Each structure stands twice: as C-alpha cells, then as structure tokens.
C-alpha cells in the first residue's frame, strides 16, 4: 500500500484501511470514513460535526486565532 488523498478530504489514507469508489465517470475515489462519503455525496465542506477540525476552528474553543468574522 501507499498514502493517498481521499479526494474529498485532507485526511489521507493510512495505507491499510478504508473504502474505494468508482462512479459512472470512472474515477479513483479512495475513502476512509462513511462521513466523508456522505459529505462527497452532498458536496459540502464539513458542517454537522466537530470531528473534522475545519469546524472547531470556525466555532472557537480550539484554534483561538481568527475568532470573529
């Protein structure tokens, strides 16, 4: 195996575990989580959960930097 981006996430594949997807267009889509897959199928950057750290930053209490917008 080898490390690879999941094509809808900064979180890369641990060369071991996760899923794959082809689609009608014929494309590589490796995945790890089902949440990621769901997100892909929606087409949105993560916005119903704290797990991805995109959300903790923009909420504050972790990443105390940009704060207000």
């Amino acid at each position: 195996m080898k490390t690879s981006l999941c094509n809808y996430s900064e979180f890369k594949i641990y060369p071991a575990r996760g899923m794959k997807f082809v689609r009608g267009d014929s494309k590589v889509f490796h995945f790890i989580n089902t949440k990621v897959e769901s997100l892909f199928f929606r087409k949105i950057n993560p916005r119903d959960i704290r797990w991805s750290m995109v959300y903790r930053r923009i909420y504050k209490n972790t990443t105390t930097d940009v704060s207000a917008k």
């Binding site: 690879s4 014929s26 494309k27 590589v28």
Partner: protein, 51 residues
C-alpha cells in the same frame, strides 16, 4: 482513447504514441496489425475466388 485503463499507474502518465511501451509484443505476434485491410466504409459485395 476512453482514458484511464489503469488506476494510479504509468499508462496514463506516459500516454504512448507508438514509442517505447508498444514496441514490445511486435515480434512473437503483432497485436492488432490490421491484417486484411478491414472495411472502413459500408459493404458492397463483389467478392469472388475463381481462376
């Protein structure tokens, strides 16, 4: 021609135009050589064997 036979391989990366990869497998038997000059346009049968 339809793009992406391999997935994360060196087929789409090279994209051969009859260079190094396709030079092989042309000595034991030529793969897809167009042996009898096939029908490009539609059939109009005037074939005969004879002497």
């Amino acid at each position: 021609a339809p793009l992406e036979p391999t997935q994360d391989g060196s087929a789409i990366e090279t994209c051969p135009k009859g260079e190094e990869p396709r030079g092989d497998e042309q000595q034991v038997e030529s793969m897809t050589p167009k042996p009898v000059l096939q029908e490009e346009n539609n059939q109009e049968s005037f074939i005969a064997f004879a002497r």
